[PDB]
Amino acid sequence: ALKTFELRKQSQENLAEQLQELRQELASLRVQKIAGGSGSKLSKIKTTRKDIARILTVINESNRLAAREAYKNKKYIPLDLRQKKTRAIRRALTPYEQSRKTLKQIKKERYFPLRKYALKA
Amino acid sequence: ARVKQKGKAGAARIYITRNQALKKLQLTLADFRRICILKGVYPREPKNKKKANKGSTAPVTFYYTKDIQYLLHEPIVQKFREYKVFARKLSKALGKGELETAKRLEARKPTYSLDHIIKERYPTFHDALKDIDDALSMLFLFSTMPVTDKIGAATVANCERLCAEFQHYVIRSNSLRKAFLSIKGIYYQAEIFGEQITWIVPYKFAQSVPTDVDFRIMHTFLEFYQALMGFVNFKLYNTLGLRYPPKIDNTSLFSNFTFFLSREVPRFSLEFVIRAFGGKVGWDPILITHHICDRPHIRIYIQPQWVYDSINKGILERTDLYACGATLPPHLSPFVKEEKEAKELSKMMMSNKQRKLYSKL
Amino acid sequence: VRTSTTFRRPKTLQLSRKPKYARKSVAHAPRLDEYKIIVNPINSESAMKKIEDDNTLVFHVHLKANKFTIKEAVRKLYSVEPVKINTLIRPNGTKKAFVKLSADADALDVANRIGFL
Amino acid sequence: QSNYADHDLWAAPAPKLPPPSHEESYNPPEEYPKKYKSLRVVPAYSNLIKEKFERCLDLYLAPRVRPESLLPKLPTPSELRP
RNA sequence: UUGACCUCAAAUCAGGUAGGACUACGCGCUGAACUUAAGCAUAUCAAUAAGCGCAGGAAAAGAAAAUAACCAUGAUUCCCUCAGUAACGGCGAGUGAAGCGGGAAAAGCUCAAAUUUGAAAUCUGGCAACAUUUCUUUUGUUGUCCGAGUUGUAAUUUCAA
RNA sequence: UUGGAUAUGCCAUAUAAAGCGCUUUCGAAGAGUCGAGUUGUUUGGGAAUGCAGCUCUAAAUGGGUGGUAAAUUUCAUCUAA
RNA sequence: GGACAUGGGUUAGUCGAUCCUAAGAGAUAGGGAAGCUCCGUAUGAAAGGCACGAUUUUUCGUGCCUAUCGAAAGGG
RNA sequence: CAGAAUUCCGUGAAUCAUCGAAUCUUUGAACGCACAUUGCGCCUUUGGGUUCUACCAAAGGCAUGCCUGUUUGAGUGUCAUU
């Protein structure tokens, strides 16, 4: 069973050739399944399929992290690299421009803010 | 599938005419020619021109669709558009009389470098050294003409700068091999890194504008050659250890010779040929073993053909033969029933119209 | 000076797309490669007879594989040159390919080397 | 600042080589262009710019493209008596 | 002949945005008939069902071109009360609010109309830096060029002055 | 993971900005909009409560509203587009 | 047994579809309509090409004149 | 049911929970044109092979309205220069 962290400490070329080898093993196992295979081989089919998924996942994480680094501190980044919370949230006013105030309101709040007070009994 | 329409592949697909290339690239003809000069893009004639050009046989120039495709992603085209935008902004500033922003725009005038263009045009520096001769011929030709309104004085100054730097490099490296004196001028020949290069350097004379050439083509060729020549000299100085650009100021054939020159000889060529082989040169300020002087009336007194013949042959020539007032030896260029039956025995089998080639030539 | 009664709109410069970012962070891997083209060979009695008679292998093939992609996938997966490909979509909705091998190779050894006999 | 080629590169397929010279100069004995006694007498060739410009045009307008006794048969008619 | 400006186009131009679904509640538009009148045409059903458009977690309304006629009250909303009342109605069947009063909750304000004229002080965008993060996904600041703008962007004032 | 205080350090050019005080002073205030007639539709709104169409179309202590039409004169009240 | 159960089975450059247009449907331009949508189909549209030139004040000049869908019996 | 195992000197079973990284076929507001047609196209880059002007494959794209800006224009619209 391929361990995902051991995958993470390998190169893209090594991951690519391991993916091709894993695909070749999966092809041979499916050949056994159609020709009549044993329970051990049929059980190895699912493990090989999951290993291929793990290889493809690890490759994708490396590719997307490389894209994030390349597009770091850039004004425009790929749409899949941007936030996706909800469409409405994206359209909403940002906290900076929601807190923008006119010079009139700044002076009013500077000089006459809500005072903390209390009443004697 | 379907009946494929005729003319959808083959010559009609890979060859593209000049007008269609203009439309494809959205360039003017002037811009297209400039790109074709800067890059390596030349017309390529097909074997079946009628098939390539629809059905017509009128003379059209063909370019590879691959070459026209490659020019689509060239940054120089964008710089042409950016300069056109800049020029239009300058026209606005001058028209509205805003001299301050006119000076600001002139300072921020967009320029481009041929760093990339040289790289793909000459993949290796050996190739660049191979195709350098036309550049040297042009710059040495324009290094002597008077500066006019059409040509930039800066470009003229850069011509002599590049020419002087290369001549100094050859002198200090002793890379000169042959030198020919012809009516055209002086043809130098050098061998550096195994590459053979020959170029012509004309005399400085009071020429005149031919009034038939387009300096726009000269301008783009000059800027390309200056860009090419600058990096070539930069590689040469760095390879031999010196810094570039410098502050302008039989390898032992003439080593023990202190040549002195008179006021009638091409001192630019004489200094080059003598110092290329270690010879020391002295000259009159207005511009001793041997005194070069071609005047019929006046330190043995010799003539420049003696030096040039010595350069060509790698052997000291005859000073007495080349003495003043004596006939000059000619100057040589250093780089230069059965039969009848066979005549009518031409019954085919000689391929198609092939043997007459050799017979005629 | 106009010699035509019609006014055609002038041609303007059409700049090509020069985006400030890529819409996709990473280009997708080829989604239909050789291993996804070939699923598994068919080993029915009719398939076996085609092996021994027509020198033709029979494969269960992806739906979106054409005759060109089947040929390259077979050449890359098995290093055998097919001379013809015939495809059908079986009544269960799966593509079946008859790969006729070249006269220099025999389908019997190819079948044993695959191991589905 | 004017560019002076401050950096190197190491950290046209067919050039159509120009024709060479055919040994015509001031006073060659091969054939007799014009003969001149001295180099000073020789004027400046006015058309040199024109030929150089013609070379410029050929660089980007001219298309670039880059023993015979076997062709006759060997019937040997000499021995043919008739 | 060059230019300036206005207007109008084009681009797979740089960067954005709109649609569709859900629709209990919310804002409009459009809009019936069954039914009641012991018939029926006004009326009623009903400013309803269906149809159409557009939002939010609430929406709408909201700081008086508001009541009142008092010793005056004081944005809006909801609740109880006014009140099945005043009024409307083949004055027939039927329909029908509001002020005050009590409470829940409370919060106020922003422009246009002014010469900055001893200085468009305002703003978008590109580029280059730094910075910040629900976040390498977010949000900015500074510099500098192009632009928008005098047919008016800032500061200043809003009737309570 | 947030909140409001604190306990401090640093950047903060308050030449500035603002509240209050009396002025023999001036004081800009939204138009095919108010309003009027008429026609539909609405309302509890009754010589029209709102809305909409069309015609006519102001004003400057002016213009709304004070739930019976109209003219004149006062009094309150509010300050629309 | 056309039932029931398990398997197997349909191979195309040349046969059809695909291509073409028919009657007709139908976006765009525009005009209606509170709207849903309606009318419209070269119309009150700036509705797209093509060739020349040493390269033109190295900021392009000079000429030349209709979507789409719709036929497995039509066309091919 | 088969099957493995994880030793039990753990990075680890599980049709487990949880979930902030990804994947997400053909579609559909559905966006290249269509669609009782796995139909018809175009643009850029790249690659492939006993075949290299051919053929094929892969990746990324090409809807409409509108807004700010950019670039390229149009006009017997207003004028200066001349």
Features:
part of a larger assembly, 4 chains, A: 121 residues, mainly alpha, 6 helices, 0% strand, elongated, B: 361 residues, alpha/beta, four-stranded parallel sheet, three-stranded antiparallel sheet, 16 helices, 45% helix, flat, RNA-binding, Ribosome biogenesis protein erb1 (chain D)
Q: Can you give a write-up of this model?
A:
The structure is cut from a larger assembly and holds chains A (121 residues), B (361 residues), C (117 residues) and D (82 residues). With 121 residues, chain A is mainly α. Chain A has two domains: 75 residues, no CATH class; 45 residues, no CATH class. Helices cover 65% and strands 0% of the residues of chain A. Chain A is elongated. Helix content of chain B is 45%, strand content 11%. In chain B, the strands form three sheets. In chain B, strands 7-6-8-9 form a four-stranded parallel beta sheet. By secondary structure, chain C is α+β, with helices and mostly antiparallel strands. Chain C contains four helices and four strands; from the N terminus they run αβαβαββα. The longest helix of chain C has 12 residues. By secondary structure, chain D is mostly helical. Chains in contact: A-C, B-C, B-D. At the B-D interface, helix 3, helix 8, helix 10, helix 12 and helix 15 of B face helix 1 of D. Chain B binds four RNA strands through helix 1, helix 2, helix 3, helix 6 and helix 12.
Summarize this structure briefly.
Chain A: Keywords: Cytoplasm, Nucleus, Phosphoprotein, Ribonucleoprotein, Ribosomal protein. This is part of a larger assembly, with chains A (121 residues), B (361 residues), C (117 residues) and D (82 residues). By secondary structure, chain A is mostly helical.
* Residue fraction in strands of chain C: 15-25%
How big a fraction of the residues of chain A is strand?
under 5%
**Tally of extended strands of chain A?**
0
Based on helices, strands and strand pairing, what is the structural class of chain C?
alpha+beta
Instruction: Please state how the strands of the largest beta sheet of chain C are arranged side by side.
Output: 1-2-4-3
Please count the helical segments of chain A. 6
- Given helix and strand content, the structural type of chain A is mainly alpha
- Oligomeric status of the shown chains? part of a larger assembly
Largest sheet data of chain A: none
N-C termini distance of chain C: 83 Å
Number of domains of chain A: 2
Quantity of strands of chain C, as a count? 4
Order of helices and strands of chain C: HEHEHEEH
Keywords (chain C): Cytoplasm, Phosphoprotein, Ribonucleoprotein, Ribosomal protein, RNA-binding, rRNA-binding
Function (chain C): This protein binds to a specific region on the 26S rRNA.
Subcellular location (chain C): Cytoplasm
Protein name (chain C): Large ribosomal subunit protein uL23A
